RNA sequence: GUUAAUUCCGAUAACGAACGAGACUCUGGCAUGCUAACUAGUUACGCGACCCCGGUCGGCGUAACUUCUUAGAGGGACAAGUGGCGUUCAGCCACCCGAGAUUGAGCAAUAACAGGUCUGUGAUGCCCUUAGAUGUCCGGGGCUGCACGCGCGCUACACUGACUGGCUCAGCGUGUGCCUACCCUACGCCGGCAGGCGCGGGUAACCCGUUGAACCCCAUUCGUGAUGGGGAUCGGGGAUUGCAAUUAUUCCCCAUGAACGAGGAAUUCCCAGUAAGUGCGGGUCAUAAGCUUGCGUUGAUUAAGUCCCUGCCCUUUGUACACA
């Protein structure tokens, strides 16, 4: 990255940003069962779980 | 050398002010208006006195050597960051002001911008904290 | 203000009511006789039941416990 | 290698208490004896650990009050080193040996106490305490707004208590509180 | 009037009103057969020796 | 081939999973290593007022996050590592590698 | 044969600057009797040939650990600062006297500059330290 | 001929202090200068009770050199105080028969314990609604 | 409100649990505010056990 | 409410009453001497750093806060 | 009876249970045994410098090792052992062995207060006002105003000191930003200081940094005098951040030098690395700590107790109280 930013600030950006997909997640998903999601970051490519009740919803 | 002399001064008279001369030189000097402790440390080291005497022992042409000294500073090579008065308003010259000038020019300062109606002449002409501070808790028995 | 509670005793009468036939005399070899014998989470509660099995064992060999 | 000295220069032995009472809360014989007065501490844990303290290190540790000197020890350490090299050329015997006589001759016999009040003896590890505490503040009150530097405060209270004269601080003190005392008997 | 000093054979229990004197029963060092329980201030131990100014008053038990 | 992989996680014990993964994959590679350096837990400190508002008596929490970072170092082509570290990570741990 | 560890330092500083006032080769500033020796002081140096004594606690510093500066002197001359009413905190000293004693100690050859930054003691006044470390321990015993 | 290093650390508040000492003549020292010029010298005779308890006598064949790193003056005055005794300790119970090492830890240990083991105290946390540790705020009435 | 909570419990602590409880804060027969708290089963309050037994929301 | 008056200077009078009687106390400081003779403290310690030179009190041990000083020996 | 504990032994018209205490989690302490380290070091070795074979070096480079440092798994202490006390139970006291024979915190129940927060919110019910903004924006002021009363605090009232030199030691941490344009700074020049100008390191065990911190220690001067204590007030000058400092933003330099001589009744906090002194980090922040949160450093007096005051818990009893 071509600024580098710090670790100390780059787990909490990715906490932070883990937090507002939270809330984002459970209030567009507040009729359709939000449990919960799970992040992972592969080599160029991100695969990020939403994890639901009604998933045909 | 502990002896005390003959003609060992008690008091001196040094701009109409008294200079009690049981104390060291460099604190003696101190109690005339316009010299503090390090103004008056530089202004006898420029005079080359030995410090260990007080200002009762030594004499008389010394002392007119000092008070020369420091009434007329930068023509014995006193820095202009040193003084009290840098580049006064009126006559624009770096002067180190003393007793009986100081308190009149102060007077002076006082006087004019309580004429030219400044926030701060007024709060002088008003006899309050004129630097800013608060007053609402601090500084009471001064005013009643 | 060294008070067993209630989970130490009654589990250390279990331990001893179950297997007297192995238990001893000494904290440091019972120690180690109840951590293979009980699944106990923690090495303070389980150092806390083995020191109540060795008193209770002086006790029994003294004699018969309630 | 025996013959441990205080400060190096005074010995030990050579002190004779002559009174029973304060033999073992006091310690100033060859088991306490130390160097400096100096010592890492772990004295106040249980009741009683106080009293094993040297008496040299618990006067260290008494000169320390009034807000402005809490926790400086290495300079009590100096004050107390010229306090007896002082009493030394002041008196001509052993400065542990004055100061084991002012403790014993300041520490009060007899205390009063709201059981109004009852007159009751005190117990003689509080004796000491109280001595070695009426020592320090008879110093510090001498000593404050004043030429007469505080290790010569020190030193003249020290042995004017030691001879008991009623012109030190601590024994003025301790005989009116033993003539409270026996008022309020 | 004598002063004699006394050695404490046990202690029996704190006693005062904010509970700051220990009252203890002492035996006299001289008449080991004579022993008198008195009030002591202060922190007390069993087997130390007390100045009694007076050696006559006795406290009597909480 | 002078390498360096560097792991760092808030947990631990994902991360010391991962970390032993790794050397142990090395070891069946049969590749010298150098051990896992712990380089010290960088401690994340807020303290906050409790109350949203002014009022209580004026109690704090204390949060922190502990952030472990360890490196393992290897002499190895770039293709064996790229082969080892592609697989078997736990989300939790961030792995980066610097190649010279 | 002895160093300058070797013996105790608060008179090795006074032999050194009597060492440099001796030499007298040190190019003092003019503005020497008029300074005050840092922010943090209230008054002048009360000794008048101070800049020989800081010229030794210095060049000490120097032979101890090289690779100082101005900051590096500035920081080892600090102290504190009463701020009158308000608390006392700690404070650097004076930059210029740090920079015109390292500059005097390089125009007569005891320091030099090394690459990393700030000065380092040259052999030259590593030998002088250690001679008069030796005179010092000689006028002790 | 054998190199008999002995390297042993000791501990106070914060300051660790540890020697080295070698089979050579008895030279104490400290982070590159002598027992009798480190600051503060009022509490010399701290670094002083090993060498002045034993006597040179027990110093003879070693060499010790201490590094200490941390705390503050009195810590580290301690620190050095307990890392020379347990240097010498090591280095009988490592090189010389057990019995003269039972023979010194006796000797030290029954003048004072904080010589040989360690104080376990630090300075411990402040709480907030307090100025320190345990010590709090002005409760303010009416 | 009372149907909804108890239709909660039983069918939560039928699927599975150690226990539960469901507080419904508010306003509620009436104007002022009250609070219904329906527990049952094991339910730990204190310590570490909290971070990873106590499923809240 | 009072007010000590040391001079700062000798006159003749304590000046021999110094050279006769202070190298003949036990304890001689500066706080002594400055309450004995009602002189400065400063004056006191430049008289007996002037004795000790002159070689009539003795030196006993010397340090910042204090200089604490004895008379001779009698043999 | 016993415990810090509704903690247990045990009694028993109650039996079996749940929460709280405990358990726990983090931290402090102990490992010359394990795992390992060019972003940590030690020891040796070889050069190099210095001093009269040796000594010093945070000078240079590398052959071993992990004691120091980092941090993971383990381990370790349980009232285990001994002597007394006690239904000989629950447990208490003392002592050996020993790094420890109560380190400190976090979480913490049922029931509640009309405690605080609509000025934390795009959490919010209801009501407000129908261009002449209570939206929002801009310009200025105010949130700082001072006859007075109070609370939290800093500095002090000096010699256990101040001033001036010199000497010698830490640990928490933090550091270049999504918008966000403002970072920590070594080193070299100029200037007395505040600072200014250059080139550099650092997204950090790398650079600041071996964090050369204060108090402390040593050596000077001062000399009981509102004094070289105190530094309020106030004049003038210079810098820095800012679009802008007047109501002095902040810093510096000089001069000015008030009360204050240890505080009335009353009252706050605390018991071991504790009180206290002492500085350093974080937050606030463009500028910035008399606050607050953390951190080390120097480090005691006293106490191992009691219900007398202030309150709390349990039992019994009394009540004309029940917004008690
Ligand atoms: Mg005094
Ligand atoms: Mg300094
Ligand atoms: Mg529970
Ligand atoms: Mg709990
Ligand atoms: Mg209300
Ligand atoms: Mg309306
Ligand atoms: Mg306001
Ligand atoms: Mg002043
Ligand atoms: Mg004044
Ligand atoms: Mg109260
Ligand atoms: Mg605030
Ligand atoms: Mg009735």
Redesign the pocket.
């Known amino acids: 990255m071509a ?8 787990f909490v ?1 990715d906490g932070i940003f883990k937090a507002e997909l939270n ?1 984002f997640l459970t ?1 567009e998903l507040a009729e359709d069962g939000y449990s919960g999601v799970e992040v992972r970051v592969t080599p160029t490519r991100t695969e990020i779980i939403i994890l639901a009740t009604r998933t045909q919803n | 050398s502990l002896v005390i002399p003959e003609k060992f001064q008690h008091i001196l008279r040094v701009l109409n002010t008294n200079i009690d001369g ?3 030189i ?3 000097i ?1 109690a ?9 440390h530089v202004v006898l080291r420029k005079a080359d006195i030995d410090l ?1 005497k007080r200002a009762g022992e030594l004499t008389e042409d010394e002392v007119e050597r000092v008070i020369t000294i420091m009434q007329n500073p930068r023509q014995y090579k006193i ?11 009126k006559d624009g010259k770096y002067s ?2 003393l007793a009986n000038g ?1 308190d009149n ?2 007077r002076e ?2 006087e ?2 309580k004429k030219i109606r ?3 002449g007024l ?2 002409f ?12 601090t ?6 | ?10 589990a250390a009468r279990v331990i001893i009511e179950k297997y007297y036939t192995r238990l001893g ?4 070899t019972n ?2 006789v109840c ?1 293979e014998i009980a699944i106990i ?8 039941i ?3 099995v ?3 064992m ?2 029994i060999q ?2 018969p416990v ?1 | 290698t025996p013959d441990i000295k205080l400060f190096g220069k005074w010995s030990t032995d050579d002190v004779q208490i002559n009174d029973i009472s304060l033999q073992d809360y006091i310690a100033v014989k060859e088991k306490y004896a130390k160097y400096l007065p ?10 009683f650990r ?1 009293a094993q ?1 040297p008496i040299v ?2 006067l260290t ?16 350490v ?2 107390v080193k010229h306090a007896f090299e002082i009493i030394h050329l002041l008196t001509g015997e052993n400065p542990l040996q004055v100061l084991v006589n002012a403790i014993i001759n300041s520490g009060p016999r007899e205390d009063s106490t709201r059981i109004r009040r009852q007159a009751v003896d005190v ?1 003689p ?2 004796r ?3 001595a ?2 009426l020592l ?1 503040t008879g ?2 009150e001498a ?12 030193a003249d209270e020290l042995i004017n208590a030691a001879k008991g004269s009623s012109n030190s601080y601590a024994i003025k003190k301790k005989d009116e509180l033993e003539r409270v005392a026996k008022s309020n008997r | 009037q004598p002063i004699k000093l006394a050695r404490v054979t046990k202690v029996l ?2 006693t ?5 004197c ?1 009252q203890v029963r002492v035996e006299f060092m001289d008449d080991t057969s004579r022993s008198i329980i008195r009030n002591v201030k ?2 007390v131990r069993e087997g130390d020796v007390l100045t009694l100014l007076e050696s006559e008053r006795e406290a009597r038990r909480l | 081939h002078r390498i ?1 992989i ?1 792991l760092t996680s808030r947990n ?2 994902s ?2 999973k991962v970390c032993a993964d790794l050397i142990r994959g090395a070891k069946e590679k049969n590749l010298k290593v ?12 807020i ?1 906050t007022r ?7 008596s ?5 949060f ?1 996050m ?1 952030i ?4 393992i ?1 290897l002499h190895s082509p770039s293709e064996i590592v790229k082969q080892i570290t592609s697989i078997s990570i736990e989300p939790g741990v961030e792995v980066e590698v610097t190649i010279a | ?6 013996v105790n ?2 008179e ?3 032999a050194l600057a009597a060492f440099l006032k001796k030499s007298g080769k040190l190019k003092v ?1 003019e ?1 020497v009797d ?14 008048e040939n ?1 800049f020989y ?2 010229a ?3 060049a ?3 032979y ?29 000293g ?7 004693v ?2 005097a100690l ?1 125009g007569l050859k005891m320091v030099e ?1 090394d690459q990393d ?4 003691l040259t ?1 030259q006044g ?2 002088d ?3 008069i ?2 005179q010092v321990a000689a006028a002790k015993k | 001929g054998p ?1 008999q ?5 000791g ?6 202090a ?1 020697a ?1 000492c ?1 089979r ?1 003549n008895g ?1 104490i ?1 400290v ?3 002598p027992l009798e010029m ?5 509490l010399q005779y701290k670094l002083l009770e090993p060498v002045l308890l034993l006597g040179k006598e027990r110093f003879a064949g070693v ?1 010790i ?1 201490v ?10 005055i ?1 620190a050095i105080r307990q890392s020379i005794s ?1 240097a010498l300790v ?1 280095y009988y119970q490592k090189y010389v028969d057990e019995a003269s090492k039972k023979e010194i830890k006796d000797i030290l240990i029954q003048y004072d314990r904080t010589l040989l ?26 | 409100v009372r149907r909804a909570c108890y239709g909660v419990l039983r069918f939560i602590m039928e699927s599975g649990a150690k ?1 539960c ?1 469901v507080v419904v804060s508010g306003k509620l027969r009436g104007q ?2 009250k ?1 219904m ?1 329906f ?1 049952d ?10 971070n990873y037994y106590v499923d809240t929301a | 409410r ?5 001079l ?1 200077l000798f006159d003749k009078a304590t000046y021999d009453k110094l050279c006769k009687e202070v190298p003949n106390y036990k304890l001689i400081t ?2 002594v001497v ?1 309450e004995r003779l009602k ?8 008289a007996l ?1 002037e004795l000790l030179s002159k070689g009539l009190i003795k030196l006993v041990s ?6 604490i000083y004895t008379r001779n020996t009698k043999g």
């Open positions: 600024v580098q930013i710090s670790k100390k600030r780059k950006a809330e209030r | 049981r104390r060291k460099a604190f003696a101190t005339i208006k316009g010299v503090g402790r390090r103004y008056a260990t820095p202009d960051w040193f003084l009290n008065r840098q580049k006064d308003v180190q002001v100081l020019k102060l300062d006082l004019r911008l400044a926030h701060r709060r002088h008003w006899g309050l904290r004129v630097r800013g501070q608060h007053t609402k808790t500084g009471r028995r001064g005013r009643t | 203000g060294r008070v067993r509670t209630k989970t130490v005793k009654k005399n000494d904290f440091h120690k180690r951590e989470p923690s090495k303070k509660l389980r150092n806390k083995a020191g109540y060795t008193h209770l002086k006790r003294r004699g309630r | 100096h010592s890492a501490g772990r004295y106040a844990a249980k009741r106080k303290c290190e618990r540790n008494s000169m320390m009050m009034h807000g402005r000197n809490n926790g400086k020890k290495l300079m009590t100096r004050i117990s590890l509080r000491v305490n109280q070695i505490w320090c110093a510090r000593a404050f707004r004043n030429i007469k530097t505080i290790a010569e405060c020190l | 229990g704190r005062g009103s904010q509970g700051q220990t202060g922190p | 360096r560097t631990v014990k991360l010391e150098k051990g896992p350096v712990r380089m010290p837990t960088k401690t994340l400190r303290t409790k109350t949203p508002c002014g009022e209580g004026k109690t704090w929490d204390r922190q502990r472990h970072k360890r490196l170092d | 044969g002895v160093t300058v560890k070797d330092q608060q090795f500083v006074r500033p503005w008029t300074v005050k020796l840092a922010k943090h002081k209230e008054l002048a140096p009360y000794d101070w004594t800081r030794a606690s210095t000490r510093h120097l101890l650990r090289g690779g100082a500066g101005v900051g590096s002197m500035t920081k080892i001359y600090g102290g504190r600062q009463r701020n009158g009413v308000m608390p006392s905190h700690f404070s650097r004076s930059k210029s006297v740090a920079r015109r390292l500059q390089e500059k930054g700030g000065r380092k052999p590593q030998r330290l250690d001679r470390a030796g | 190199l290093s002995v390297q042993v650390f501990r106070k508040k914060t300051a660790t540890v080295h070698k050579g030279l020292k982070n590159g200068r480190i600051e503060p010298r009022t060499d050199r590094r200490v790193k941390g705390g503050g003056h009195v810590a580290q301690y347990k090591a083991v360690a104080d376990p105290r630090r300075c411990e946390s402040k709480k907030f609604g307090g100025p320190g540790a345990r010590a709090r705020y002005q409760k303010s009435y009416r | 226990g409880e002022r505010a609070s708290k527990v089963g094991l339910m730990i309050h204190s310590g570490d056990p909290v | 009072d007010k000590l008056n040391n700062v500066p706080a400055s002189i400065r403290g400063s004056l006191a310690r430049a750093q010397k340090h910042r806060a204090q200089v």
